[PDB]
Design an enzyme around this catalytic site. Structure first.
Site, PDB file in Angstrom:
ATOM      1  N   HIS C  72       0.817  -1.204   0.000  1.00 14.77           N
ATOM      2  CA  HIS C  72       0.000   0.000   0.000  1.00 14.77           C
ATOM      3  C   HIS C  72       0.854   1.259   0.000  1.00 14.77           C
ATOM      4  CE1 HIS C  72      -3.737   2.192   0.447  1.00 14.77           C
ATOM      5  NE2 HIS C  72      -3.160   2.925   1.382  1.00 14.77           N
ATOM      6  N   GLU C  75       1.919   2.333  -3.694  1.00 18.33           N
ATOM      7  CA  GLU C  75       1.060   3.213  -4.473  1.00 18.33           C
ATOM      8  C   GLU C  75       1.035   4.637  -3.930  1.00 18.33           C
ATOM      9  OE1 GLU C  75      -2.820   1.553  -4.441  1.00 18.33           O
ATOM     10  OE2 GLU C  75      -3.510   2.687  -2.702  1.00 18.33           O
ATOM     11  N   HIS C  76       1.551   4.864  -2.722  1.00 14.57           N
ATOM     12  CA  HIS C  76       1.796   6.222  -2.253  1.00 14.57           C
ATOM     13  C   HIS C  76       3.070   6.808  -2.843  1.00 14.57           C
ATOM     14  CE1 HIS C  76      -1.068   7.198   1.127  1.00 14.57           C
ATOM     15  NE2 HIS C  76      -1.378   5.937   0.891  1.00 14.57           N
ATOM     16  N   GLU C 145       5.403  11.352   3.115  1.00 12.33           N
ATOM     17  CA  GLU C 145       4.186  10.547   3.055  1.00 12.33           C
ATOM     18  C   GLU C 145       3.892   9.837   4.371  1.00 12.33           C
ATOM     19  OE1 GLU C 145       3.235  11.048  -0.154  1.00 12.33           O
ATOM     20  OE2 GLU C 145       1.195  10.340   0.215  1.00 12.33           O
ATOM     21  N   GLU C 152      -3.334  10.313   9.712  1.00 13.96           N
ATOM     22  CA  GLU C 152      -4.639   9.697   9.500  1.00 13.96           C
ATOM     23  C   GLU C 152      -4.804   8.391  10.274  1.00 13.96           C
ATOM     24  OE1 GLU C 152      -4.856   9.206   5.337  1.00 13.96           O
ATOM     25  OE2 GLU C 152      -4.124   7.135   5.313  1.00 13.96           O
TER      26      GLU C 152
HETATM   27 ZN   LIG Z   1      -4.248   5.722   3.112  1.00 14.62          ZN
END
Ligand SMILES: [Zn+2]
Lengths: 441, 122, 464, 97
Positions: C72, C75-76, C145, C152
């Site tokens: 994951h 893709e960042h 990032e 979050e």
């Molecule tokens: Zn995310």
């Protein structure tokens, strides 16, 4: 027993290739148009897709709404495809669900659309269901009464977006006439609403010259032969409350909004009839789109713009093009300053790479909007209802033929007209209402 | 059966008109109508038909039932000037109830139930 | 009774022969590069826009506990620049095409696709191979990032259905690779760097685990030439790290269990009841699709829920048992999930749970031919609606090649769907549902959700 | 400056016009003159029971004179029909002129 063959394995040797291949049509299919004796326009395009779409476009919408029948377009959107003179709501719902077809109703600023999308094998069923649901609709008292809570909660959900509210205030402020009527109304407006109000609105908008039957993925001759005994519409063509751009400035207060929105707009003269002006408006909308995320987790950062959303609307005779930018409540004056300075930066001149970028963006949006069968049928219906013909090839050719001189002269002639200012939220930094109108000068 | 069932319908109509004459004479003294004799507790279709009605019709039906029950408690009838104005056969419910029952008959042929139940209290 | 309006349509369900649709459907042409990479295209006869991308047979299942969430984070980070293009150059090159770049990371499948016009296929191939093979993976962008992802994490910013399905995977496939979440825990996000990303890319993004699929306005042989020019440096398989060997080494396990996530002040209750489903290769996965169509779904924005042909939708819409719900059918390489997810209130949790459990258990005894025929017609019509969009056709090509090893013709899929009757539905429900353990996950206002023994007792009927 | 308010179910339409009272509550004479101006703008003062003063356009007239520290706000608020708001503005400007 059931099938025991593994999915990576092919199925048993009795797998008949009953479909025979060949032939694709040698030419690109084109839109055919033929009116009926009642005056209904029928406009269909054939498509190699296996999905047939049928959309009925009726002139009306929020433009045809009186103060007696305010909010009737949303209630007609919710209350469509219910019981008719030949079918109950249960029978019609079962008929739609049996063939695996979907129906929709959609109310615009100047029209209302009803449509059924289905398989090509079940196009007659879709046509008959749509024809019965629009022509013979019985707007009963209890079914209309039981849907007002759903209508009110959907309206409250739609007004929670500040963009929708700013769009409503922009359309009222910019226009005088039917185009300034509110579409997404307050939920309190539909309080004293009954099915007689809906019947009055439907009777006001219905006339055989105000109705376009559009289709996608069907033969035109068979469609006219089957829509001959169904679309026998009788009615009086009510006068259209035509609209003119006037501009101005209005503000809407939201006491607990953490973002202050600023909307700016200008008139797209000519409307949807002018292909060249529509193409130039699309290019200006693509140019003003500063932060369009084209990649995942892009991190564009403006100093004042929290969010920027440009728009371009095209109606019969006029339209709007402009931009709505949000921002901090304490930063609204700088948001206004940047939004103002951006359009002189566009009017001074556009480079060839920037023009190529905006033309490619607008062409991509235009050819993506008609890539699906329902989108193609909707575009055909909207174009025939507004201007009498559909040709996106001419729109694409006008987009491709645009030079930098055309866009520069278009924006220079656009800045010579009246602006339009709309602000949302708490306005503790609204600098001057008169001076911001004189900044363009 | 079809040879004798062609004319068995006027005899049914005559008996029905005589029955409605006698019962409507009985009903008019209480100020009632034939449709007021249907109980939402006794039938769930009547309960469904009653919520499909406009509010003033329901208010009028409740007023008539209240007047009749008060008359029944007092062992009285309506006075002559009110009794001459009574219309025991003016329907307010038969169209809606007929539609409700037709919908229920339509759903049952496809194996579907009615989209309502009995009135359940407590 | 109108003569023109009451012909050709009736509500009685009947089987529909979808054979004349297949004559106009395009065919798929598959080639294989020498490194094992497959290129498959389906040419729509009159199309202007094209979508294309790389489907990789990899995901969070094929990670370890030390590097969970590397896929994951990829893709960042993969769109922040390459060795040939900077950030701004990549931005202007993408926006010159008039299109979008998008990526999706799953548990067993990863996608990196683009949506362009028919004149920009070659530029899209070049930019996709440049992104996938020649990325910078800068440490400064990784540090930028990580702060966003950690903020979050600490704000607890997640969709409620995502939270429920992640809890359901973590309790249903516990002590299995499929039990991990895609995003990964806080510690692995806080302690990630360039080398784990590089090692994951070099280990798992090999030749035969990747498929280049395109659909719309595209020529096959030209795309083969472009793919051989661009993706030729992709390494091949090592025999000890094939997908089948990794599946055999660390298989999946299903345990009947319960989990809930109780909050002190929450308006909504979201719950999911799932049984052990079928894999992609299981021949009973097609009747599971028919059963998922039979259960259906509903939301309160629809006013005709009471007229639905599905009994569960009828009960939920008539009694008002939930705000929204949807039956699901997830398939994996060796296992799967099957059941009903829904959003409701605390005062309707037990009634909604009983509606779900009673509608699931009834399918082992009471199946009507009309509902089966209706659901088969709805399934085939939904399959034809995916053919209308280029994005769904490309996703179908990539997924079908990755999980079946081939491209199933639409005639075979229609013949497989058309072979399912009421007896097969009864037998499949008897195998998968009846008197079996299940997994139950919940979140929000869940104090009135019943415990595991309540759910477990309502998998069987003592009355029969 | 100027602003606006959007009210969805307001049966009337309200227009406010105001100016600054220079000096605020500190100046006796300016506050007295502002109070006199407020009384001069009193068009329909209810000095008697059940008296019906009819205006062509207005439905209600309500002036004011606030005197804060250093500055003030003297003005008038007038109602009117929704379709006659421009007439309300014109009549208010005519009254001040
Ligand atoms: Zn995310």
């Amino acid at each position: 027993g059931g099938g025991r063959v593994e999915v990576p394995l092919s199925e048993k040797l009795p797998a008949v290739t009953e479909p025979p291949r060949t032939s694709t049509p040698a030419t690109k299919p084109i839109v055919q148009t033929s009116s009926l004796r009642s005056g209904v326009k029928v406009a269909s395009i054939n498509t190699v897709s296996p999905i047939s779409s049928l959309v009925l476009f009726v002139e009306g919408g929020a433009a045809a709404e009186t103060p007696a029948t305010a909010g009737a377009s949303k209630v007609l959107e919710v209350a469509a495809f219910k019981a008719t003179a030949n079918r109950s709501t249960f029978r019609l719902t079962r008929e739609l669900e049996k063939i695996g077809a979907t129906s929709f109703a959609r109310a615009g600023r100047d029209h209302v659309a009803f449509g059924v999308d289905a398989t090509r094998l079940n196009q007659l069923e879709a046509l008959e269901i749509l024809a019965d649901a629009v022509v013979n609709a019985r707007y009963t008292y209890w079914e209309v009464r039981d849907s007002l809570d759903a209508v009110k909660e959907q309206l409250a959900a739609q007004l929670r977006n500040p963009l929708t509210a700013v769009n409503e205030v922009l359309h009222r402020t910019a226009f005088e006439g039917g185009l300034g009527h509110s579409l997404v109304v307050d939920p309190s407006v539909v309080d004293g609403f009954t099915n007689e109000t809906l019947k009055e609105y439907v009777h006001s908008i219905m006339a055989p010259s105000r109705v376009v039957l559009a289709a996608s993925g069907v033969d035109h001759a068979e469609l006219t032969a089957l829509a001959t005994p169904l679309l026998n519409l009788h009615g009086n063509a009510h006068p259209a409350p035509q609209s003119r751009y006037v501009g101005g400035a209005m503000n809407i207060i939201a006491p607990t909004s953490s973002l202050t929105y600023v909307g700016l707009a200008f008139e797209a003269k000519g409307g949807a009839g002018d292909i060249k002006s529509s193409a130039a408006a699309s290019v200006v909308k693509a140019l003003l789109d500063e932060a369009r995320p084209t990649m995942p987790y892009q991190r564009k950062e403006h100093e004042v713009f929290t969010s920027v959303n440009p728009f371009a609307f095209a109606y019969k005779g006029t339209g709007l093009v402009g931009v709505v930018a949000s921002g901090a409540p304490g930063k609204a004056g700088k948001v206004v300053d940047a939004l103002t300075a951006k359009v002189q930066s566009l009017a001074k001149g556009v480079t060839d790479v920037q023009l190529a970028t905006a033309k490619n963006m607008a062409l991509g949006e235009l050819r993506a909007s008609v890539a699906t069968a329902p989108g193609l049928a909707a575009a055909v219906g909207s174009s025939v209802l507004a201007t009498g013909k559909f040709s996106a090839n001419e729109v694409a050719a006008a987009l491709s033929g645009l030079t930098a001189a055309d866009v520069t002269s278009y924006v220079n002639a656009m800045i010579k007209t009246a602006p339009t200012f709309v602000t949302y939220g708490n306005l503790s930094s609204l600098p001057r209402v008169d001076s911001i109108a004189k900044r363009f000068a | 059966t079809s040879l004798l069932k062609q004319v068995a319908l006027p005899v049914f109509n005559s008996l029905a008109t005589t029955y409605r004459s006698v019962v409507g004479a009985k009903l008019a003294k209480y100020g009632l109508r034939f449709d007021d004799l249907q109980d939402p507790l006794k039938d769930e279709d009547v309960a469904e038909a009653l919520r499909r009605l406009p509010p003033d019709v329901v208010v009028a039906r409740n007023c008539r039932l209240r007047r009749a029950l008060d008359l029944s408690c007092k062992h009285e009838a309506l006075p002559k000037d009110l009794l001459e104005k009574q219309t025991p056969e003016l329907s307010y419910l038969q169209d809606v109830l007929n539609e409700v029952r037709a919908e229920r008959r339509e759903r049952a042929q496809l194996g579907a139930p009615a989209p309502y139940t009995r009135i359940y209290y407590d | 009774d109108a003569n023109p309006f009451l012909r050709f349509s009736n509500p009685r369900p009947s089987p529909i022969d979808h054979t004349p649709l297949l004559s106009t459907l395009p065919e798929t042409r598959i080639t294989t590069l020498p490194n094992g990479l497959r290129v498959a295209t389906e040419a729509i006869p009159f199309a202007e826009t094209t979508t294309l991308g790389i489907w990789i047979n990899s995901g969070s299942r094929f990670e370890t506990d030390a590097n969970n969430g590397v896929a994951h984070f990829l893709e960042h980070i993969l769109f922040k620049g390459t060795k040939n293009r900077s950030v701004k150059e990549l931005e202007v090159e993408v926006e010159n095409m008039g299109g979008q770049l998008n990526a999706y990371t799953g548990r067993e499948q990863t996608c990196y696709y683009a949506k362009v016009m028919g004149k920009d296929v070659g530029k899209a191939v070049n930019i996709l191979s440049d992104i996938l093979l020649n990325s910078n993976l800068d440490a400064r962008a990784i540090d930028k990032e990580r702060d966003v992802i950690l903020r979050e994490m600490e704000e607890v910013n997640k969709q409620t259905s995502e939270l429920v399905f992640d809890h359901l995977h973590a309790t249903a496939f516990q002590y299995s690779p499929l039990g991990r979440t895609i995003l990964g825990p806080v510690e692995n996000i806080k302690s990630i760097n360039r080398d784990q990303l590089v090692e994951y890319m070099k280990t798992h993004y090999r030749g035969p685990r990747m498929v280049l699929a395109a659909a719309g306005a595209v020529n096959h042989d030209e795309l083969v030439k472009l793919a051989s020019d661009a993706f030729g440096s992709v390494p091949d398989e090592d025999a000890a790290t094939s997908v089948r060997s990794l599946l055999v080494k660390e298989p999946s396990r299903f345990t009947g269990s319960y989990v809930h996530d109780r909050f002190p002040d929450a308006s909504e209750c979201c719950m999911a009841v799932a049984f052990k489903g079928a894999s992609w290769t299981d021949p009973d996965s097609i009747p599971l699709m028919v059963m998922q169509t039979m259960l259906g779904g509903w939301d309160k924005n629809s006013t005709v829920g009471k007229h639905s042909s599905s009994a569960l939708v009828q009960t939920v819409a008539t009694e008002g048992l939930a705000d929204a719900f949807m039956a699901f059918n997830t398939n994996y390489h060796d296992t799967g999930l099957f059941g009903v997810y829904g959003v409701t209130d605390r005062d309707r949790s037990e009634d909604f749970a009983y509606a779900i459990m009673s509608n699931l258990t009834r399918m082992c005894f009471e199946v009507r031919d009309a509902d089966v025929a209706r659901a088969k017609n709805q399934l085939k019509a939904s399959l034809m609606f995916f053919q209308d969009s280029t994005h769904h056709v490309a996703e179908s090509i990539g997924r079908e090649l990755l999980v079946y090893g081939r491209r199933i013709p639409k005639a075979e899929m229609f013949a497989r769907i058309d072979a399912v009757d009421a007896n097969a539905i009864r037998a499949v429900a008897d195998r998968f549902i009846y008197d079996q353990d299940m997994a139950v996950a919940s979140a929000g206002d869940v104090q009135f959700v019943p415990d595991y023994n309540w759910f477990r007792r309502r998998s069987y009927w003592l009355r029969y």
